[PDB]
Amino acid sequence: MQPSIHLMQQNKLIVPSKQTQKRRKPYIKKHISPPTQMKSQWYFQHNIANIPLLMIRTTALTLDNYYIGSRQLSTNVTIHTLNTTYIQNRDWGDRNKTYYCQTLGTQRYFLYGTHSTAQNINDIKLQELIPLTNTQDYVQGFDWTEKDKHNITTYKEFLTKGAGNPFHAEWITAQNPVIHTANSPTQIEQIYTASTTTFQNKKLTDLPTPGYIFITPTVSLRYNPYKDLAERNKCYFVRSKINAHGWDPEQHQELINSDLPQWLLLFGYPDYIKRTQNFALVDTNYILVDHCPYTNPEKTPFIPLSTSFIEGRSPYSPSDTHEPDEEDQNRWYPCY
Amino acid sequence: WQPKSIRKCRIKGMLCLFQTTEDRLSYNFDMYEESIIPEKLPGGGGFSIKNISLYALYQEHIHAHNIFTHTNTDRPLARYTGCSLKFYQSKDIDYVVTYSTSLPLRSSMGMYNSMQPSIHLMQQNKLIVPSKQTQKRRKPYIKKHISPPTQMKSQWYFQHNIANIPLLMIRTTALTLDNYYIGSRQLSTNVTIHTLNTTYIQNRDWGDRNKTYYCQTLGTQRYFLYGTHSTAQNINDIKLQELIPLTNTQDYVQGFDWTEKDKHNITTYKEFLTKGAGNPFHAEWITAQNPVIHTANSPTQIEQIYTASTTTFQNKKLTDLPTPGYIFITPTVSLRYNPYKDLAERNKCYFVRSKINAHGWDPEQHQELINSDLPQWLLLFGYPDYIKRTQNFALVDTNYILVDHCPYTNPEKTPFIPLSTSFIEGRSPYSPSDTHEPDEEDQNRWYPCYQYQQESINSICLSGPGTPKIPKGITAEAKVKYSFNFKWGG
Amino acid sequence: WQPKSIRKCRIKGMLCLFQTTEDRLSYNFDMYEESIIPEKLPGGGGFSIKNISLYALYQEHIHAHNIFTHTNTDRPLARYTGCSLKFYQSKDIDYVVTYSTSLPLRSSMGMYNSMQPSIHLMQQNKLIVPSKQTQKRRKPYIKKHISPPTQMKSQWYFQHNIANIPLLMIRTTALTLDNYYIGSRQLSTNVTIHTLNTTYIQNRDWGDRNKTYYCQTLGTQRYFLYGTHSTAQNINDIKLQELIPLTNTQDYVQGFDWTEKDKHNITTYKEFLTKGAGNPFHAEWITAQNPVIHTANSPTQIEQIYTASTTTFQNKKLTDLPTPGYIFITPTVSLRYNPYKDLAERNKCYFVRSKINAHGWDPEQHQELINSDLPQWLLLFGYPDYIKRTQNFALVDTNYILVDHCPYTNPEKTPFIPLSTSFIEGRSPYSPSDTHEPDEEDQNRWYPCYQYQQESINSICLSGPGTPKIPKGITAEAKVKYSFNFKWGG
């Protein structure tokens, strides 16, 4: 149905716009025969009521700006994506359950935001970090120094109230430094239950497991349809409401596409899935994924992210509403 | 002796000829669509060279831009009959086309020079495509039948035997029949060209933290440029503490005075030269907005002086340097040029390496890569892209730079040397006004180099007749529909 | 621009298409006439692939099978016009023909599969030649004119420049339009196939006097087959002295009991295994006419036992071996198969090396040499000869063996493994009944190998539709007269 492949289809009909071309009569008229199965005999009411008589396929295009619009700075489209090398947990949307980016073996890993001005990773103080500990909540978090502001008496209240959104505008893009580690905040729980005021001498390296890496949640890929083909690229849906890792299909192997380049391959695929499979919620229940080796920055599996979600704004609100709307305050997680 | 089974087969698809813009007016498109163009950087080209081959058509079908009327599977025999081209009218730009079917179909230096639109119209057997704005036709396309190449006879051939042989070569470029000799807001034809001041900037070795930059070397003595904030017009009273030497390139750093010693943790003047170094090409020094003094100082002399005593500079004057000569010399000058006042009695252009510690602007690479007998606005057109496609130099964009000789400017220097306005005003290329500083990527490449010639040589081309002066920030498309007739067999 | 002197020249001669027989029904003839076929061994083939070239015609003239109307001496220029073929009717067999003149004329795996007569008739642009018995025509030959290859134009060429280029490719096979789905004495369609019992015979390393043969190796334990003459059905009371181990292959030896110690000058049980070894594939053990017991004995255990004491075996029982398990396992089983009950939902066939000490019947040589989606009676047809001509393996006949997978037999084993009736009944191939023992030459090759698959895979092909079931011991000829038109020049 994508227009550029649609024109190649035989027995087509183009309708030039009045701006593109001025015709003598502003309409194209044709006679269409009945379906070849339906003979020219008589039938009852409510016996041919639901039988289709004519099926119309239409799409929009522009014969003038075929390969490029006008203000289009370039063809060179930027695609935001989840950093799938470290964000592998598909279970979001729970106040009670903390969010771990990935689980290697039986150890969970977490992302921590900090405001440290020192580039060293070992001197960053444990008080300054702002753990995620949740999703679905567009909350930016705050430092341990803000203990008095939110009526905090213990670090448990800090994690319940001072939790920050990993996907928040100040952390999704890594505008502020964010550190991935194997901290397992239960370790900090034990440390401050032993003594919470002793954190003045607690350093980032004192955690039982080493590894403190600046890992951004999302990266901006650069892509180009003229440089992209279809030697192996593929796309499909995966559930977003399960506590399982990996981005492989587990739902329906009949709902995998492949042998077209990305700009064609994506076209109409979500709506097709909506109409054919009738999944639980489609929009809210799960998410779409693809595999494309033809981007400048490439990750075996990919994962779109609208610019609105990356810049911290509700969808389809261009610039005026800089914060997520009232309705989506309880759904701000990677979702269709 | 026709084969047993034949099947008529057509190939129908839309081919995007070029997407051009003001900042990308005179570059070859078809070598840029294969390569990824970074976002927020205008690309494309105002002219394209097409070598349509059967393997190229199959590759296009892989990208899903065309269809086959009948598949060629298990029919190795092939037979070519001819092609039909439908040139669609662009909405707001004008393009002319021409096609050839000779034996070699090898692009040459003369062909790319002749690709410039005003000389392209003079070429015989042309075809103009008026834009819808320029003229409203009955049918918004020009259709013609093109015979196969005259060498390729009408016999049968194998698959992957005529795969790479060209069947049709298309030459296209953009123009504007209305604003032929001038755009509209074009204040005048009177184009300004920034150039390196080649009378004193003669060293071609940039891009080294360790090695200082000397503008020129006469005999065995090196000369250096120093920036100062002195408010006195006298050249002898300017204090030695106030000067800000260059001592480096490739670093967009503006420098600071000796009075700022405490700010950057400076204990010796060596730390001053390592940290307080300034870019000679910086926006506050390239244009000579602030005074800059050329001399034969040889900063090792100042090294000796302050190793003797650094605090004694309160009584050290500019004239105390062992070698005299302190001249206000701007790094770059703005020439005024006019294509109607310029001819081709001796002008010439060529490339020279930018990564060697040698002086002079003469060619030393390839005497076969010199052009001459056309005026500048024609002579430059497509010349860089020609060099990219033909010679395959090391990096082209980064390895070296282009130079010309033109006696027809108001201010004239035997050899010249473009400089895009972006590089002169201290901004990354193709960023119009918002990003006033060089980007993150080019912080380690801010030296005179081909990635900073772009807009200047493009404007030199643009000043010539027939250039499509479109509004800034808009992109113009040009689509062509191709129908190749084939007959698979076997 | 015709040459100065031309001379019309024809080439007339008789070409023997194939001489087939029941035991040689589905092999390519034209690769066997070049090689010497030993006397008293039927040869030929039921189908032939012909690549008639000018050099081939000259070679035929060297053998004096044709004539030239006019000599080509001192006339290097050549011109081809066309060929006329006269297909003579065979006396008592039916053959169909087809011809192609494409560019490559390279035989493929699909072509040789499609060569089987019942699928060959379905091919378009065919030609049937009824036998004189089947039908009496007015003129006992079919004559047609065949155009030159469509790539070869009607221009002039040099000698030894078109010498090796094919001019005409002939595909032929034998059939019988009368007995299409069944012969005559054919008791039934219900063909019996002997096969190696692959559930326990899994070792592919045969043909070594020094190395003993183990049927299979589970983990690190080897299993062996033992023949005995015990008249008691109990498996635990069978005495250890009565067993006759294999301990070798490639030797058609039946073995003997420990009681025959004196006959062969045996002093120790090592001499018993060196001399009293028996062939597991021998006529009295392959079919399990005499009981044979599979076990995990590992004869080194018996070595230890008799080195401790050899005369104490009077009290040694079969159960005293360190590892239990004594199963009556026949080396080969007779499957029943039917082409009308067999399809192609998953069946497959391929070759595997027979001269390696490795287990399993999976392919490890070439995944490009697997066939599948045809029923067995088609799938096997011409496949060995195709492999001979295309891959040029080490020895084909002796180096390795063929295997298939077919779930459609009454008794079914994931992988299968033909075995000609001759090898199962202990006789040399192609010797019907007179020579009851393997010949002198094959005394040192009597192991499962391609030289013993012949009649079985041939019978599998024969069971299919359209096979010319001729009487045993008769040979059928098929002669074709070819007339090539040429024009020498110079």
Residue numbers in the entry:
A (entry chain b): 169 to 504
B (entry chain 0), C (entry chain J): 55 to 544
From the paper:
Our initial efforts to study the structure of an ANV particle, derived from a Betatorquevirus isolate called LY1, were performed with the full-length ORF1 (residues 1–672) expressed in insect cells (Sf9) using a baculovirus system (pFastbac, Thermo Fischer) encoding a codon-optimized ORF1 construct. However, full-length ORF1 particles lacked the structural homogeneity and symmetry expected of viral particles. Initial expression of the ORF1 protein in insect cells (Sf9) suggested a proteolytically susceptible region of ORF1 that resulted in the removal of the C-terminus. To prevent potential proteolysis from occurring in the ARM by trypsin-like proteases, we designed the LY1 ΔARM construct wherein residues 2–45 are deleted. However, we continued to observe a smaller ORF1 band accumulating below the 62 kDa marker during purification, confirming the proteolysis was not limited to the ARM region. To identify the region of proteolysis, we generated polyclonal antibodies to peptides from the jelly roll domain at the extreme N-terminus (residues 46–58) and the C-terminal domain at the C-terminus (residues 635–672) of the LY1 ΔARM construct and confirmed the presence of the N-terminal peptide of the LY1 ΔARM fragment and the absence of the C-terminal peptide by western blot analysis. EM analysis of the LY1 ΔARM fragment showed that the particles formed were more homogeneous and symmetric in morphology relative to the particles formed by full-length ORF1. With the C-terminus of the ORF1 polypeptide removed, the protein spontaneously formed symmetric 60-mer particles, as determined by cryogenic electron microscopy (cryo-EM). We determined the cryo-EM structure of the virus-like particles formed by the insect cell-derived ΔARM fragment to 3.9 Å resolution from 6271 particles and of the mammalian cell-derived LY1 ΔC-Term ORF1 particle using cryo-EM to 2.69 Å resolution from 22,743 particles. Despite being generated in two different cell lines and the presence of the ARM region in the mammalian virus-like particle (which is not visible in the density, suggesting flexibility) the two protomer structures are very similar (1.179 Å root mean square deviation when aligned over residues 48–562).
